[PDB]
Symmetry: C5
């Protein structure tokens, strides 16, 4: 894909918006606990660790279809959509400002309940193809649900970097975050941005505004280029753990809004 | 509406100032605990969660009527454009207090635990009501009917339901735990918010008169005041006060605004 | 006053320095716990809350006499000193690095003692007149010592913004910080800068250098103008709470240094 | 060597990429706890402190062989000059896991405590081995024989002993708790380091492919690759995993490097 | 002294490097606990507080003698002007150690609590001794007489006594809990300091060789070296080590300095 100049003129710009609902484990909108995982089922040992699919947060992904650009496909150059900038926001942050939800008391039974807190993971990506993933787990002896996309035939090497443990973020709510992360050795045509704070009871911290833009251009001034006129939006927004009265625990996720500006870019015809 | 150029000349600029008092639950100035919520009443289960109206912090909103700009058939009209804002949370040092009745830090010889835990700060300046998206921790919660909440909730309301939208058009009626600013709209409002969770988290706040936020968008256009009305919205939950019996009350603080506005030409629609 | 241009030429710049001692409650330098509050006395209830004067930290304020400027008061223009910039420093920070002071053991009786920690409040202001204050309290039912300056005839409204609850910081060690804060609806002729972290055991965080300057000019390039050739310096620097063996507690404060550079500014005669 | 100007023209730039696997103590890819240390064995006293080799995290290092530049007679020669690097800690989200066997957050119905506590991140890019300075918590520790540590330690080694120097010239052999980058040397390497201590501190990390670090010094010169060899070094201890018995293992993560190099003219010495 | 222009020309620039070992109380390189304080001895009362010399961390200071620049009989003279410094706290990774004898994180199967709690970092570069201000937590404390502390203390010394001044003119003698840099003086020194308190706070430090601090003031003048002497001062308390019995030792680390200096013209006094 030899990249040429930006196409100028009227209607060289377009703009899309989308939202991605979280995939915390309860991933059906009819689910009573939609937006949460089911009760974390903990390993009994190193050898015996079979997390339920409903307990494992996965990446969200959506494909946005863009307007057709080329008529004559036999020419020397073609146009592709180039993602230039994005405004993105985690929605419903203030829903966490809630001390009455059933759960564990902060102090005794006269007090409010512990709000969602603990480990957080926030990531968004904008690309002209699927986000390229690298596999790495806390334990290679974990048995993952066969309906999810995880690493095939793990060995202890998979607790670190195994260069064969690669995948594409090409299915919504299927790739667990505890197995997959963005592959920095690839992703030339995607931009991804991530933030992790761990711990079991850590206070979550989030900002929200409509005044902030991220520019997506690389050091050659080129944004993600949308193969087949498709734009890939990916996210995970784990905002912590909700603790229940029995002390069972559910992951809590929040949806993410994207507003992307794209322009026309000239490329050599492959 | 097609936005044209900034109107120059004498008297092109004006300033307004306002303060919004907090709406934590006790929302009447004669309430003993004005500026606080009542004792949080907790759900007994997923199915049974009936929070009292007085326990749910809501958004503050005020509408500022600006000087009338157009007497109406001319081909262009003028609108007030909010260009910048100085905003401040007032009475921060009020929380620097270890004698207020409450729960002892250590044993009964010590000071009491000051306001701490979850904080939520938001301000917005817009030319029309702030646009809101509904999302809740639990769709089986029964909200007081006197408040404005999501009609006919389903589990989808625990995440993004594009049908759950509203306008912040009433002071002290829209619960913060139910509504947040809608990033898919709000072209004519600028909003800024920060959240830090937890049950005992130390609150952190700055105060100064040296800082200004510029409200202009990427085209150099600030919010434009429809019908010459400026909408100022806020919430500043500064934490949780814990009482001796361990009952808890949200504590809020008031917010000052000083907004500078200029005259903007628009094509008459 | 209508402000005009800066006066150029020789002797048009001056510079002052001052320090302000903290007013934590023990405010007499002969007091045994000078620089600390007395043991905090706690409310027994909502209705019954009578904090002792020696337990309530108050703002520091000093007036600095500047060189007299206007020989002829009938002139159509006059000169005022304009505060341009300030270096300011909290002094004796390292005095907190002390684990042997009598107090509460960190662990058992073999360990050091708990250093000063908890709620901190830092504020400095430079103005050409007294800092204007707004009243707001945790509880309107609190009975304050009568020989302090507080809100007269409080009602529950004073737990929020009562527009009638106003004052000037015109007395050193008289205005409790828990009652008064800088009023953002005025203070046109003062710059103030403030920083709060709460909690009961929070670690204090402080910087110290002689390499940092704060410019006092507003958006029109005008600094505080010193009425009657007087410069007002105000401060509070609560660095936390010292816990005693019996678990009684004292607020701890530190003095603040000011170095202000001023220039002559032409104003129209009123 | 006298350093002259940058060589321009076609084919003057090159990129390499590599990843370094962590060396936490279990350092063989077939080890059950590869990517972790073994259970920490604690000293019985000041005098009796014999940490097992598998319990001591060490630095990672890789040598990248670059294209040969010289066909050695001439007055000037060429060297590879490292200009910039993109680096990334991989598999961060693997820590977002509350079901791994371990210690319960609350009682036995809760999730388990994730990796937390002390973290140490370092990467370096240089034209030769990273130069190290020795300093320990205790000179009466007896280190495993098969590791490289300070010979004939004395109490002076609990602070700066100018004789205690080394080169990071072996992967998984130099303990982090013994060696750190020597700021009095390393003129031909750039290193960047971050430490947060504590027993149970929440780990914090970001990840992106939008960030580049420029390696040029104040004279605009990057590390120069002696013998066409580029040295990449790292450690990324991300915290401690606590087991059900309360035994503890260090946990590390691998680091990706992408380095851009150019040709630099130097005088033939 | 009237300061004139910078001397341009060849050989106008010089560089020095140095390191300062910490003085935490065990200040002798043969001390078993070199680089730490002795076990903190606590006051039994307000009235009775006698910290041992070995439990009180003190400032480090070195004097670097620079090349002689001047004949003293000419209209103008030259002084060395400190222009910039690279500085580094060394052996940071030595804290990354969970096996050192101490207090268990959990029960006796776990690692031990690492150095944590109060930290104090300061460095200064000056052309004469750092000027100090005295201020103490308690005026009734009896300091060791062979240390340099405030003479005849009164309760005024718990705040600002303008008479309580000193010079940092001796290594390992001036306690940090008594003296701090005096902002009312030090026109010929640049000092930079950071404090975080608390008893168990995680320590946080960076290390790199890519960062320089410029020492020029607002007039573009760096510290001027009187009698061709450069003063380097430091303290780097990195936390508290807790022992098995719960006794506690301050822990310090050494600091490296690399200072660049230039020739400055001054009028002969
Ligand atoms: C008489 C009788 O047996 N009635 C039972 C009810 O007791 C039961 O209600 C559930 O009972 C739990 C008792 O430990 C608990 O009160 C449930 O409420 C919560 C919880 O605390 O666990 C409230 C939480 O807010 C909720 N979690 C979330 O919404 C997100 O984290 C959890 C959650 O729904 C469950 O834990 C599932 O993971 O429930 C309370 O609902 C009822 C249902 O089991 O059955 C009756 O017959
Ligand atoms: C024998 C008897 O019943 N006597 C009652 C008093 O008990 C009662 O006074 C109230 O008593 C409480 C005992 O736990 C408590 O001491 C009340 O003080 C506080 C509190 O700690 O709860 C002080 C708090 O500062 C205050 N909270 C706030 O202002 C904001 O968070 C609370 C608050 O007013 C209440 O918790 C209600 O939400 O009160 C003390 O007032 C008295 C009044 O009912 O009646 C006596 O006869
Ligand atoms: C032989 C005998 O019994 N003598 C007694 C003394 O015991 C007594 O001295 C005081 O004893 C207290 C025991 O509860 C305590 O140790 C006092 O020391 C401290 C304190 O911990 O309370 C030390 C603190 O550093 C100090 N606080 C500050 O300086 C700033 O926070 C406090 C403070 O002075 C008091 O708490 C008052 O606020 O004191 C110790 O002085 C002696 C005096 O009561 O009486 C003898 O009979
Ligand atoms: C019936 C019977 O006795 N079976 C035994 C098993 O008990 C034993 O399995 C091990 O049992 C341990 C009992 O405390 C423990 O539960 C082991 O699980 C963990 C652990 O918590 O220690 C799970 C951890 O996630 C894992 N740690 C890591 O992977 C990284 O920190 C550790 C780790 O594998 C070991 O502790 C090594 O330090 O194990 C559980 O595996 C079994 C094997 O010993 O032997 C059976 O006969
Ligand atoms: C079998 C028997 O009786 N053995 C004893 C030894 O136990 C004893 O050694 C000392 O024993 C102490 C018991 O509390 C303690 O374990 C000493 O180790 C430590 C400590 O935890 O106190 C280890 C610390 O790392 C070290 N601190 C530092 O290095 C820096 O902070 C401290 C420190 O050296 C002392 O606390 C002095 O302040 O020591 C352990 O050495 C032995 C000699 O005492 O005598 C045998 O008979
Ligand atoms: Ca690649
Ligand atoms: Ca829209
Ligand atoms: Ca006003
Ligand atoms: Ca050197
Ligand atoms: Ca002076």
């Amino acid at each position: 894909v030899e990249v040429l100049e930006v196409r100028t003129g009227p209607d060289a710009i377009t703009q899309i918006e989308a939202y991605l609902n979280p995939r915390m484990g309860n991933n059906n909108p009819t689910d009573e606990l939609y937006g949460y995982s089911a009760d974390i089922n903990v390993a009994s040992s190193k050898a015996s660790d079979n997390p339920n699919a409903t307990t494992l947060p996965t990446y969200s992904v959506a494909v946005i279809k863009l307007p057709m650009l080329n008529e004559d496909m036999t020419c020397d150059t073609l146009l592709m959509w180039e993602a230039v900038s994005v405004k993105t926001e985690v929605m419903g942050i203030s829903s966490l400002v809630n001390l009455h939800q059933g759960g564990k008391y902060i102090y005794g039974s006269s007090s409010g309940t512990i709000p969602v807190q603990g480990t957080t993971l926030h990531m968004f990506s904008v690309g002209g193809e699927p986000l390229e993933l690298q596999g790495l787990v806390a334990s290679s002896t974990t048995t993952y649900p066969t309906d999810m996309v995880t690493i095939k035939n793990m060995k202890p090497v998979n607790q670190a970097l195994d260069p064969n443990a690669k995948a594409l973020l090409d299915k919504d709510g299927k790739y667990p975050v505890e197995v997959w992360s963005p592959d920095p050795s690839k992703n030339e045509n995607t931009r991804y941005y991530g933030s992790f704070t761990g711990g079991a009871t850590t206070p979550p911290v989030m900002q929200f505004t409509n005044s902030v833009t991220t520019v997506l251009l690389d050091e050659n001034g080129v944004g993600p280029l949308c193969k087949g006129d498709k734009l890939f939006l990916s996210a995970v927004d784990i905002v912590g753990i909700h603790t229940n009265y029995s002390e069972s625990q559910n992951w809590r996720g929040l949806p993410r809004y994207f507003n992307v500006t794209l322009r026309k870019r000239v490329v050599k015809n492959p």
